[PDB]
Design a binder for this molecule. Structure first.
Ligand SMILES: [K+]
Ligand SMILES: [K+]
Ligand SMILES: [K+]
Ligand SMILES: [K+]
Ligand SMILES: [K+]
Ligand SMILES: [K+]
Ligand SMILES: [K+]
Ligand SMILES: [Mg+2]
Ligand SMILES: [Mg+2]
Ligand SMILES: [Mg+2]
Ligand SMILES: [Mg+2]
Ligand SMILES: [Mg+2]
Ligand SMILES: [Mg+2]
Ligand SMILES: [Mg+2]
Ligand SMILES: [Mg+2]
Ligand SMILES: [Mg+2]
Ligand SMILES: [Mg+2]
Ligand SMILES: [Mg+2]
Ligand SMILES: [Mg+2]
Ligand SMILES: [Mg+2]
Ligand SMILES: [Mg+2]
Ligand SMILES: [Mg+2]
Ligand SMILES: [Mg+2]
Ligand SMILES: [Mg+2]
Ligand SMILES: [Mg+2]
Ligand SMILES: [Mg+2]
Ligand SMILES: [Mg+2]
Ligand SMILES: [Mg+2]
Ligand SMILES: [Mg+2]
Ligand SMILES: [Mg+2]
Ligand SMILES: [Mg+2]
Ligand SMILES: [Mg+2]
Ligand SMILES: [Mg+2]
Ligand SMILES: [Mg+2]
Ligand SMILES: [Mg+2]
Ligand SMILES: [Mg+2]
Ligand SMILES: [Mg+2]
Ligand SMILES: [Mg+2]
Ligand SMILES: [Mg+2]
Ligand SMILES: [Mg+2]
Ligand SMILES: [Mg+2]
Ligand SMILES: [Mg+2]
Ligand SMILES: [Mg+2]
Ligand SMILES: [Mg+2]
Ligand SMILES: [Mg+2]
Ligand SMILES: [Mg+2]
Ligand SMILES: [Mg+2]
Ligand SMILES: [Mg+2]
Ligand SMILES: [Mg+2]
Ligand SMILES: [Mg+2]
Ligand SMILES: [Mg+2]
Ligand SMILES: [Mg+2]
Ligand SMILES: [Mg+2]
Ligand SMILES: [Mg+2]
Ligand SMILES: [Mg+2]
Ligand SMILES: [Mg+2]
Ligand SMILES: [Mg+2]
Ligand SMILES: [Mg+2]
Ligand SMILES: [Mg+2]
Ligand SMILES: [Mg+2]
Ligand SMILES: [Mg+2]
Ligand SMILES: [Mg+2]
Ligand SMILES: [Mg+2]
Ligand SMILES: [Mg+2]
Ligand SMILES: [Mg+2]
Ligand SMILES: [Mg+2]
Ligand SMILES: [Mg+2]
Ligand SMILES: [Mg+2]
Ligand SMILES: [Mg+2]
Ligand SMILES: [Mg+2]
Ligand SMILES: [Mg+2]
Ligand SMILES: [Mg+2]
Ligand SMILES: [Mg+2]
Ligand SMILES: [Mg+2]
Ligand SMILES: [Mg+2]
Ligand SMILES: [Mg+2]
Ligand SMILES: [Mg+2]
Ligand SMILES: [Mg+2]
Ligand SMILES: [Mg+2]
Ligand SMILES: [Mg+2]
Ligand SMILES: [Mg+2]
Length: 63
RNA sequence: GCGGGGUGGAGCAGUCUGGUAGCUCGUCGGGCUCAUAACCCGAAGGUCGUAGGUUCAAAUCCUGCCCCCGCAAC
RNA sequence: GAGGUAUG
RNA sequence: AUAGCGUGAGGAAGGCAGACCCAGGGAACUGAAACAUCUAAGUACCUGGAGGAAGAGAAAGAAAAAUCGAUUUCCUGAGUA
RNA sequence: AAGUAGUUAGAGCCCGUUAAUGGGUGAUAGCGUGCCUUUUGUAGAAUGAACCGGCGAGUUACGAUUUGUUGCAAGGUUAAGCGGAAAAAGCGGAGCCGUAGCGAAAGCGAGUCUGAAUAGGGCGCAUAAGUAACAGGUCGUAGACCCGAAACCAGGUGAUCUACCCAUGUCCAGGAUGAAGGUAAGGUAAUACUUACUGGAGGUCCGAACCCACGCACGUUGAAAAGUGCGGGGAUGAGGUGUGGGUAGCGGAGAAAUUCCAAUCGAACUUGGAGAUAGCUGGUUCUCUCCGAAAUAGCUUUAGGGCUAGCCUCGAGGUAAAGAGUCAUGGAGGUAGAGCACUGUUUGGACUAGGGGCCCUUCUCGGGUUACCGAAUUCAGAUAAACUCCGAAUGCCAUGUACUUAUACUCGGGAGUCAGACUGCGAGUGAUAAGAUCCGUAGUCGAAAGGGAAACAGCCCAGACCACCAGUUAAGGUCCCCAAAUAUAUGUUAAGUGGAAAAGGAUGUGGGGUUGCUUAGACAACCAGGAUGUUGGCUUAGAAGCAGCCACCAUUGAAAGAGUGCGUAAUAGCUCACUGGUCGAGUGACCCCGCGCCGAAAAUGUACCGGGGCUAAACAUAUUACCGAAACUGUGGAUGAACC
RNA sequence: UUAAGGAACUCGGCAAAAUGACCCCGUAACUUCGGGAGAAGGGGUGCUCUAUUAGGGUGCAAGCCCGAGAGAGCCGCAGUGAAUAGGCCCAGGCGACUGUUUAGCAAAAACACAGGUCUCUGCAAAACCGUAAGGUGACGUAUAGGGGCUGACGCCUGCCCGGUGCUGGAAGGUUAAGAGGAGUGCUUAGCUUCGGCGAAGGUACGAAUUGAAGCCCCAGUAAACGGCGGCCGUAACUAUAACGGUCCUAAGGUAGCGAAAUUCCUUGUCGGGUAAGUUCCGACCCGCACGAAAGGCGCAACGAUCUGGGCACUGUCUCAACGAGAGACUCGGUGAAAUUAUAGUACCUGUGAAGAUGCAGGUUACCCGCGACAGGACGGAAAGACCCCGUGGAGCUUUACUGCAACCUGAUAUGGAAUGUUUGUACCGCUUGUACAGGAUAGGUAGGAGCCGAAGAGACGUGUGCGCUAGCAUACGAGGAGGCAAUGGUGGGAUACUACCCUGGCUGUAUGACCAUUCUAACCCGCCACGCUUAGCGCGUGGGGAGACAGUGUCAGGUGGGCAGUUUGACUGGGGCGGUCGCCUCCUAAAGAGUAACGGAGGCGCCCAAAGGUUCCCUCAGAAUGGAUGGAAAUCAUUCGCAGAGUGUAAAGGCACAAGGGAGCUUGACUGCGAGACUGACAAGUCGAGCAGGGACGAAAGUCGGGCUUAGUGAUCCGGUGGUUCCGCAUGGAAGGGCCAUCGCUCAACGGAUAAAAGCUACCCCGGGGAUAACAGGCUUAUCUCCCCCAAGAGUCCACAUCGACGGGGAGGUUUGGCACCUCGAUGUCGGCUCGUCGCAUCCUGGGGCUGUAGUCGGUCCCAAGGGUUGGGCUGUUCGCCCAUUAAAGCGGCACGCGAGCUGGGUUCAGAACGUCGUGAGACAGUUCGGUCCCUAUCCGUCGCGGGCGCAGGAAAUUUGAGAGGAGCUGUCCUUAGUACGAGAGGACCGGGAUGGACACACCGCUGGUGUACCAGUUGUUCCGCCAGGAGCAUCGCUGGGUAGCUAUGUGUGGCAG
C-alpha cells in the first residue's frame, strides 16, 4: 500500500500545478526528477524488506 | 492503467490442494395463536459473470471479453 | 379493623 | 615479636644519535581493480630495557643404506617446496 | 581610417653590410579568424597562461623477455670470499643455464603419455647452439612520470575564544505599583465582613548604565574577516561581569541548533604512517628522415576503464608466388522486381450451411419464405518485411596457363585505438521530421594543405619535399567588385522568375495534336419575333413556361422547349432556348509539352543571387576560345626504398 | 521641509511620519478577580501681582529651603514653547507566562519552565565516567534519586493486549561449552598360506545420558511501541436511514473540534466585511488524510510571534521639487587593487562548435581625451553547490551482512564441612506373572514321576494386598491328614514339586549423581573499637556481619546499532521507474557469411526405455456420395487427392525412392580414439570418414558412437561417492593426496567479484563532465496558432452575407514536445519596477469592398504599424475573476528583453510544526511561520563636453543644406437637423465650429513649494564684567513668514491648414 502511495506521489512530482507557469515550472524539472527518484528508491527499499519478510507459507488445510 | 472481486434473494466461505456445493439471515408451505411476529416441522431456490480451452471429469487449472468497488489518469 | 417484618 | 620510626654504608633517579636491537602493546590508508578472511604489517607509532653492539648460541639438533658435529652473517638452494 | 597586426607585390625617403641578386622604413594593393589543451569538430562566446627570468615531469636498483655486439662453444660462466691501491690478475666450479623429452606420478627414455593395442593422436626428437657480459626496447616489484583529493589511522597540543560548571568577588541611576501580615474604627451574641492606615512582596512595571540583537538602511577589494547609524528587548534576576580554575576529540559541553570546543567542527589543530589512493582532470622541454592507424568485434559489478583479436610499425624468414585487378569458365545463394502455384489481407459477382424476423401453422414438427444478415464453396481481379510457381543486376567462393600489377602469409619486438562526424546509396526506429538515432555500403574529415561553394572540417575538383616574376588543365567561371567572352547560332521567359514554399485557382505566353461551325455566310455584337390549345394538369392565399408531384404532347409558322433562370399570392414584367434580317472571315471546345502568375507574413537594418547591378550579365539546346589549383609538366636542387 | 489627495505604493503601511513628559477627569468586553489599564477618549501646563503666601521643614532665635489651591491680569501661531520621554483599537491562530536558542542568514509556533504521568531504584540504590582503583549520585535515603513522555490553568483523556516490547510464571520442547566415554578406524606381539585374522598399549574420531539463561509457551500490561473496518437492505416513498442482516477484527475513532499551522478537488458553499476580497472572521460538514498526555477542546495576562481590518499620521505613492552636508568634480601632496594571450578593439545581415569587436558581404566612421550610464565583451570572483558519473568519501538509521564492548546465564579454578529430599546403579530378601482355547490366574528353560506334609496337609471362617475383579498370595481361630500332579484333553507350550532365569513391585544394604538447608576456616565488608597516627586513605589486631554465594580469571550460549567496518548492479535517445541481462528460431539483414537499436514476432531451462538402433511392411489431409444408433463432423466401402497431413515441443529449412506410421528383435542413448574441416579474441561449441575392441539388427549388402536438423544449459575453487599394476616427508603402514568416472549452482545480473550485505542525507565533501539532463540558444515542426482547397449542409429560399462537417494542403517558429549540437575551470530563475525597441497575424483612430448594409449600431474581409493602447480589489503570482473607466484597454519577438540596472514576495539552503508514508533515519509540483542578491567600468557601445589637425594664405561674423533626429494620438458638446432613413421606436453621412484628456516644449508674471549668510517670536543654558541689548550650542534648537534662483501640481504654446 505504501508502495502504491509512493507511486502516486512520484507520478505527481512531475505534473505541475495550475498555479505554476510554464517558464517557472521548467526550472525545477530536474530537482523534481530527483524527488521522483527518491520515491522510487523508497519503493525498492520496501521490496527488499518484503523479501526479508520471507516466503511464509499458508498453512495446509487437508482436504 | 493497478488492485480486489463476479457462487440461490443479501452477506461470506469453498479455489491455492480438480471429483465434495457449504454457514448465518431470508423465501415458500404446514403447524401454535383471535390475527402478525417469535418458536416448532418440512421443502424449494445456485450449471458458480460470460465464451472458449486442458482433463475421464472443472466453481476450482489456462486464455479473451463483459460488469461492480476502490486507487490513479482525466 | 388497622400498623411492623412483543404487538393489534 | 613484627609493623612502623630513626641513624649510618652502598646504589639508582635524568639525558641522548630523529641511528642500530630486545621485549611489551599495536593501527589504518592501501592492495585484492567493491569487500569482510587476507594484505599493507608485526610496518608506522607509544613504552620499557639496554649495550657498543644487541639478539642467538655449545644439540632433548640437522639429517638418512652416510653421516655431520655450538651459534651468527654472506653466496646459492629459490621465487623451489 | 577600422581589421590576430603579419606576409607577398611595392613606390618614395634614408643608410652603407660578415657584399649579397644589401639593410631600415614603409603610402598603397592582394591574401589572411593567435598558441596550447581537449574534442566528431575549437578563431573559438570551451580550458590555461599578465609579462620576463630562473627551477620544474619515464629515473635508479633488482629480476623476466627480445634485438644487436663481443668472447668461448656442447659447452659457457663463476657468486660470496682469499688477495690486493675504495685497483688488476690469480684463486674460488659451490651453484646457474643449456645439452632430452614425455608423464599427475611411479617410471620409461629418442622416445614417452593415453590406451587392451603392435593402432592412431598429443608433446618431443628427427629438423643440434647455447652461454657470460654490454647496450637498446619493453615488462614486473618498488612512489616508478609529474603535480593534485575529499577522507582514514597513530602519538601529542589546546577550554587566554566559546559551552557547561567550581570557589571567590563585584555591578544594576532614578521613579512606580502596592501581595501576605499587622493595628485601629465600624459590625456581630461571636465570627464573618467593610473601610482606612501601616507594611514592603514580585523570574512585577517604566526607564539609563550593563547585557542582548527584532527591523530597516549603509557598508559589502569594509573604518571593521560580522560592524555603523536610526529605532528595539531585558534591566533584583533562570541577571551581568571580573579573577583564578575543571571537563579534550573513539572525546567533552549543550534551556538542544548539527550548537560550541582559539576567525577550523555531521566529528578540532598539529605532527607522523605518507610521495595515502585517484580506471579522474591538467601537464610532460631539441631536430629532421621513412612508414602510418583507429574510434570495430567479443568478454567484462562492464559501459569516458581494461584484456584479446582487427587495424600500424620494425626486424628476420619461407617458397608448388600463395596477394590485388580484369577476361573466360563453373558454382552456391532467393534480394530487387514480378507473380498468386501455398499461406495470410482483400474487392466485385454466383451460390449457401446456418442465425433474425413476418409468419402458415404447430406436439412451432415441417413449410411460404425474406435479398436482413450469412460460415464456407466457386469465377474474375488486387496485396504482402516476417507469402513464393519464378527470378535478375551486383557482390561472394573458386579454377586458369590467359593479361597486367605489387604484394600477401608466418615468426618475433614495439605501439596506439575501443567518444567517431557528415555526405551519397540501401533498410530500420522516428512522423517516409531532425545537423536525430542505429546498422550496411563507398567516400571526405579525423590525421589534408590547395582551387571552387560569399564566408564554410564533414559538399565539388584535387593529394603540398624545396625554389622559380614559366606552361597546360579540373571544378567553377568570363560586365564591375574579380582573372578570363558584354561569345557564336536558334528559340523561351517579362516575373527581377532567375535569386524559395504546397494543395488548388487562372482567356498569361509559346509549341504540337485532335475535333465542331463555316463566304449556300461561322462567331461576336445590333435589330425583329420568341407564338399557341392549356394557365400541361394538381395543390394551396399562391404555382398558371420557371415551390413541389406526375405528365412532358399538339396547332401555326422562319421559330418557339407542356419553356433556362430573376421575379409575383400567381399574374405580370426582365430574360433564356430557337428563329430571321445586318455584317463579312475565321471561329469555339478539348488533351498534352515547356516557361512563367496568385496562394506568399515576423520580429536590431535593405536582408531568400556574396554585393553592384543585369531584361540579357536569366533559361534551354549545341559549339569554340580563354581564366582558373600547391593538380600534371618544365628548369634546378635535397632525399627514401628497390634494382644496377 | 513640501501644494492637493492620503496607503491609490507595496509580498506586506518596509521605512518614514504621527504619539510622547507632569497633573486632572474618565475608562469597555473579558477575567485565573491579580489584571485588562498608561485602556481608550479628553482637558490643563507660560509670565506678572495678590505672595517673606495658605501651609510645611530647619533653627534658641535671626534668618535659610519646599511651595496648595485660587483669583485678578499680560503676551505670542504655539507656553513639558528647545532636547530627552507610548501610536491606539477590533478580531483571530500558535505557544500559557518571565527566560533560552543556530558566535558570523532563521528569536520562532522550536528548547526550557512550573505542573501531570509512567517507570525504575532497599543503599556498597539505580543510572553514569573510568580497564580497575576511585568518584559523582550524595556527604543524600522512596514526600529521595535516575530515565522517558506531556507541557500553566479549566473540563476531560474513550475502545483495542492479536502483534511488538516490558513484567511475572515454571510443567514440557529446543538449546552450548563442559563432564561421559558405548564403540569405530590406524598401528602390531602373535596367528595365518597368499588374501587375511588379530590381545595389550598408544593414537585419530567420538554416540547414549547429563547440561543454564534465552527462545517456543501461558497470564498481564497502552500517559508502553502502536492500532482504532467493510457490504446489502429498510419509513406512505423523494431523499436519507432511527432499524435489520452478514463478513472480518485484537478492536473497529468516544467526547470535543472541524475546507483547520491539518482540506487534494477548492478562489468549496452560505453569511459578514470591501466599489471590487485566491487572504480575513463566523457557520456548514463528502474530516482526500483531526482526535484525545506525538495529548483533545477551551482560556485571562503575556509576545521585537503570525494573521486580517480600522482611526490618526505621513513623499510609500499620484509625480516629483528644493535645500544642507559627505563622497563624486577641479587644484596640490601621497598612492593601492581585483584583472590582463598580443591588440591599430564600429554597426546590420549572414556563415561558423548551430548566440562574432576580430570571418564574409555591405554600411558607417578624422586624431587624443574628460565627465556620466552600464547593452555586450556568453564580463571578474569562486576547477557548478543543480544534474550525472566515480566498483570515490563522511555522517545518520534499521528486523542489510559480519563483528565489538557491555550485560544475562552456565561449567571450571580461587574453594571446604556436614545433614537431608528426590531419582539412578548393583546385591540380599520377599511378593508378581491370566491373550485365545483349556478343569482354570499357563512367564520361560530344564529335570521330572512321583512330590509336600501330624516338628502341622487339604478344606472351613476372618482381614489385608494385588488385580484382567476370574480369583491369587499372605497371616490369624478351630482341626489334624490329607492333598496335587502323572494319565486324558486343551493347546505354540502343562499342569505336582525342584532349581537357573527373566519381567516388573516393596524392604534392607552399599555405592554413586542432582537439588535444598545449615555450619565455618577460604574470599569479601563503601560496619564498629584500638593501633601505626596530628589521617574520613591504607594496612594490622579484636569483635560483628555476610560466606563457599559474591568477585576475579579461563571457556561457553544468548541478547546486543550502545559502538564499529563495509555492501547496497549494468544497459539506458540524461538519471530514475517500467523492461531486459543466458540459449534457440524467423524478419530486419541490402540473393555467400556476418551485420546494430529499450527494432517486429515467438519459444527454452524439457521429454522419450520408445518418441532410440536395425530389418521388414505402407502412406496422409480434405471432399464427393452410399449408408442403422450417429448428428456439420466418430467408424466403414468406392473414387479424387504431391502432401492441402504428420514431423514429442517455438519457428525456419527439410522430408512421401521417408526423416511421416505399424510389427518383430534389441539397447550403438557403446570403450579407446580420430586424418581433416567449420567456427572462432580466448574459453568453448560443431561436423567427422576411418582404425581397433567387443556387440545389436538383418540372409546379405550394409546401418547403428541417441532422437529430421537447429535450444533443453552454466567455469574454476571447494566438498562427497566409486575405482586405481600412482605417491606416501627415516623404513613398513596409515593419514592425506593425485588420476579416471560421477554428483552437488534460478552462481538465471547465466565468462560466475565475497562463504556472508539494505537504506536516509535538507548538515554534507572530493575528482571530473556540456561524453549527460534542468533555463536560454540551435535543428525539426507531431502538436500550438494562423491562413487556405473541396464543398455535403445550415442560413423562408439560396453552399460560398455569416458559419462550414467528412477529408486535404500550407505558413510561422509565440505553446506542448522530440533531438542532445555550444556552454557544468558557472550562460542567474518566476513575477514586478526603470527603460524601452521591433514585427504585423491592426485593439482604437484612418481608407475601402461584400452584407441576410433601411438609419443607429454591426458582421466579415482588403490597405495601413503614424501615434495611442487605464487605474484599482484577491493572490508571490503570469493568467484569471471582480469594481470603475476608456476612443481602445492588441497579439507577440528581443537569453518568453532587461538582476556588473533594482526588488527578492514565490521557489529548492540550513530552523520548526501540521497532516500523511516509512520500524527508522527521514521524505511529500502537500501546507504553514522564518530566512546574507558581491564587483572602484579596461575596450566597444550609449549620453554630453573639450583639446589637436585638416579643409592650398591668415582672421572675424552671417549662413545654404546633403544628411539625421523629433513630433505625429484623441474624445465630448453645439450646428447642419430631430434633416435623410424608418410604420413607429429611433436616428445619420459629409461639413462648419467650441471645449477637454493624455503627451511634449518653454518660462516663473499668477497660484503654490523650497529657500541652512533675509525678518520676527520663543525655551533651556553658557558667554559678552552687571541691567539692557545681543551672541554660542541645542536637527538651521523649535516656531511663523519669505527674496533671488530652482521648480510643478502653476502659466503660455503645440500637434492648425495642408
Ligand atoms: K651477549
Ligand atoms: K606418437
Ligand atoms: K589555531
Ligand atoms: K470542513
Ligand atoms: K556594460
Ligand atoms: K553549466
Ligand atoms: K545584463
Ligand atoms: Mg465440481
Ligand atoms: Mg398488548
Ligand atoms: Mg581495494
Ligand atoms: Mg573574443
Ligand atoms: Mg585565464
Ligand atoms: Mg614563466
Ligand atoms: Mg590539557
Ligand atoms: Mg522585571
Ligand atoms: Mg515588558
Ligand atoms: Mg542601539
Ligand atoms: Mg525595563
Ligand atoms: Mg563590559
Ligand atoms: Mg575564565
Ligand atoms: Mg536538522
Ligand atoms: Mg603507506
Ligand atoms: Mg599525493
Ligand atoms: Mg605516406
Ligand atoms: Mg517487392
Ligand atoms: Mg519479400
Ligand atoms: Mg549525428
Ligand atoms: Mg551512412
Ligand atoms: Mg582525436
Ligand atoms: Mg580542403
Ligand atoms: Mg576562399
Ligand atoms: Mg581544425
Ligand atoms: Mg605528395
Ligand atoms: Mg590555359
Ligand atoms: Mg576583368
Ligand atoms: Mg606534385
Ligand atoms: Mg504633501
Ligand atoms: Mg498640507
Ligand atoms: Mg493595494
Ligand atoms: Mg498595484
Ligand atoms: Mg515600522
Ligand atoms: Mg513563548
Ligand atoms: Mg545568526
Ligand atoms: Mg537575527
Ligand atoms: Mg516535568
Ligand atoms: Mg564503585
Ligand atoms: Mg511538546
Ligand atoms: Mg519473558
Ligand atoms: Mg501571507
Ligand atoms: Mg488514550
Ligand atoms: Mg519573551
Ligand atoms: Mg572618477
Ligand atoms: Mg568542476
Ligand atoms: Mg553502522
Ligand atoms: Mg577499508
Ligand atoms: Mg547507470
Ligand atoms: Mg546474408
Ligand atoms: Mg614413511
Ligand atoms: Mg555477464
Ligand atoms: Mg528543515
Ligand atoms: Mg564537486
Ligand atoms: Mg553535448
Ligand atoms: Mg533545451
Ligand atoms: Mg548560449
Ligand atoms: Mg571562464
Ligand atoms: Mg562568468
Ligand atoms: Mg494586413
Ligand atoms: Mg497579497
Ligand atoms: Mg495586486
Ligand atoms: Mg527573461
Ligand atoms: Mg528578474
Ligand atoms: Mg552580465
Ligand atoms: Mg524569499
Ligand atoms: Mg518542501
Ligand atoms: Mg517563506
Ligand atoms: Mg558603476
Ligand atoms: Mg573608460
Ligand atoms: Mg513662480
Ligand atoms: Mg539663548
Ligand atoms: Mg539680560
Ligand atoms: Mg557642549
Amino acid at each position: 500500500a505504501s508502495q502504491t502511495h509512493h507511486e502516486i506521489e512520484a507520478g505527481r512530482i512531475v505534473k505541475p500545478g495550475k498555479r505554476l507557469n510554464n517558464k517557472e515550472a521548467s526550472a525545477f524539472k530536474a530537482g523534481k526528477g530527483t524527488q521522483q527518484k527518491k520515491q522510487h528508491s523508497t519503493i525498492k527499499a520496501l521490496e527488499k524488506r518484503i523479501e526479508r519478510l520471507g516466503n511464509v507459507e499458508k498453512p495446509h488445510t487437508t482436504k
